[PDB]
Amino acid sequence: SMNPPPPETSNPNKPKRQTNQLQYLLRVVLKTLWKHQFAWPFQQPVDAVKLNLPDYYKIIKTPMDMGTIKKRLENNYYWNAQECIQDFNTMFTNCYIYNKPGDDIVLMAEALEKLFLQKINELPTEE
């Protein structure tokens, strides 16, 4: 069994910038989700080998996790807030695609997603 390489977190070929919105995504959004009691499954890529999930990376072809997002934000990898919001949405959606309704991990994702929605609702206007 083998895991894929993780999503990239650095690429000199990719345009990037700092924006006040991206700063909020790190300081408010990421930080709020990261400290949550239910964050831990999402703090790093799914280890399909150790979890014995050999079909995971057949079903989930665009993996994403908050460890990757955190590094992307700390590295200023993004051009805009939408790119980062899309990564969060991919992460939640992947969990719902792979798992069953009412599974613990789905309840965890829902708790994080509720906070994510609350925080992104107050994403500042771009400066």
Ligand X SMILES: Cc1sc2c(c1C)C(c1ccc(Cl)cc1)=N[C@@H](CC(=O)Nc1nncs1)c1nnc(C)n1-2
Residue numbers followed by a gap, the chain, C–N over 2.5 Å: none
Q: What would you report as the CA-atom Rg of the chain, rounded to the nearest whole angstrom?
A: 15
Does 104 participate in binding ligand X (rule CB under 6 A)? yes
Least separation in angstroms between residue 103's CB and ligand X is 7
Interface with ligand X, residue 42, by CB under 6 A: yes
28, 105, 111, 123: residue in contact with ligand X (rule CB under 6 A): 105
Total number of residues that touch ligand X (CB under 6 A)? 10
Number of H helices, E strands in the chain: 6, 0
Q: Does 51 bind ligand X (CB under 6 A)?
A: yes
Q: Does 115 bind ligand X (CB under 6 A)?
A: no
Written as six digits, the tokens of 96 are 């719902």
Rounded to an integer, what distance in angstroms lies between the CA atom of residue 125 and that of residue 36?
A: 26
Question: Would you tell me which residues interact with ligand X (CB under 6 A)?
Answer: 41-42, 46, 51, 53, 95, 98-99, 104-105
